[PDB]
UniProtKB/Swiss-Prot annotation, chains A, B, E, F:
This is 2-hydroxymuconate tautomerase. It comes from the Bacteria. One of its GO terms (molecular function) is isomerase activity. Belongs to the 4-oxalocrotonate tautomerase family. It catalyses: (2Z,4E)-2-hydroxyhexa-2,4-dienedioate = (3E)-2-oxohex-3-enedioate. Keywords: Aromatic hydrocarbons catabolism, Isomerase, Plasmid. The active site is at residue 1. Its EC number is 5.3.2.6. It comes from Pseudomonas putida (Arthrobacter siderocapsulatus). Homohexamer.
From Swiss-Prot, chains C, D:
It comes from Pseudomonas putida. Belongs to the 4-oxalocrotonate tautomerase family. Homohexamer. The active site is at residue 1. One of its GO terms (biological process) is xylene catabolic process. It catalyses: (2Z,4E)-2-hydroxyhexa-2,4-dienedioate = (3E)-2-oxohex-3-enedioate. This is 2-hydroxymuconate tautomerase.
């Protein structure tokens, strides 16, 4: 499995590390797949690069 | 957060549903994010559409 | 014998493969026919492509 | 599930009725589906209506 | 189907959520029923509001 | 736990017997409760005794 996760930029290396591990375990667990086959890509979203409903996420929320 | 997960085709609706849930909870847990903000897209990979080391995954396993 | 089986989508490769095997054995057994002559085609039915009583199956379930 | 089974003509009512029952049970069993959702259609193939390898089946048998 | 489940209070949101899901699936499965049509009400029982044998349950387990 | 399940009418004994068992196990499983403590009441709804949206269910949708 290959997960690409889009997240708003603003987080700790530690927190992102936790995301990677937690997600990888959830994938491996629920697909009954080896952990080794699980790859996670995290793609950070700059403050003005993500929109919800045509507004900026930063603005509305 | 928006996770797109690429997986090999061949799984029950039940198992995919559990992937979605488990992954969503891992994301919302580790980012301290509302669940409501978590979106998961599952993109299935046909047997002949995913290669590992230049050779088909079904093959290479 | 050639069986075409229409089933609702949503099942594991494993389960469909069991269906194929089980059905094949039931045909061969009951017709006293060689297994080799038994062919099975599964045709999956998308969640809006199968109706019971004019309503979607998804909605009545049976 | 809806199975349509194509078989060569020439069989007893009994034997076909066993086919229907056996197949139905194999489907219900392997899909973990209610028996009562299982429908089987048997379509018989006349002696000159089924070909294997471009030659009539009656002639080549399998 | 409409299930109202009476349970003793004292359990995680997480855990009640899983009750709802599991029970819904058991109903839909065993009645061959659309899930959509399954509705579950959890009503909670305060420690002094549930009696077994004229005794408080709290007490008698 | 005590579930009361409202269901339409018109089913097997066998099917209702499965419902009871399936549900009971889902409750016991998800609450980590003893089976023995699980009670299920099933209440059947006559053809003209259940309404969805003010019409009869027999008739919706
Ligand atoms: Cl109790």
């Amino acid at each position: 499995p290959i997960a690409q996760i889009h997240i708003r930029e603003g987080r700790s290396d530690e927190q992102k590390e936790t995301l990677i591990r937690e997600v990888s375990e959830a994938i491996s667990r629920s697909l009954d797949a080896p952990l080794t086959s699980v790859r996670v890509i995290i793609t950070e979203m700059a403050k003005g690069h993500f929109g919800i409903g045509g507004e900026l996420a930063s603005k509305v929320r």
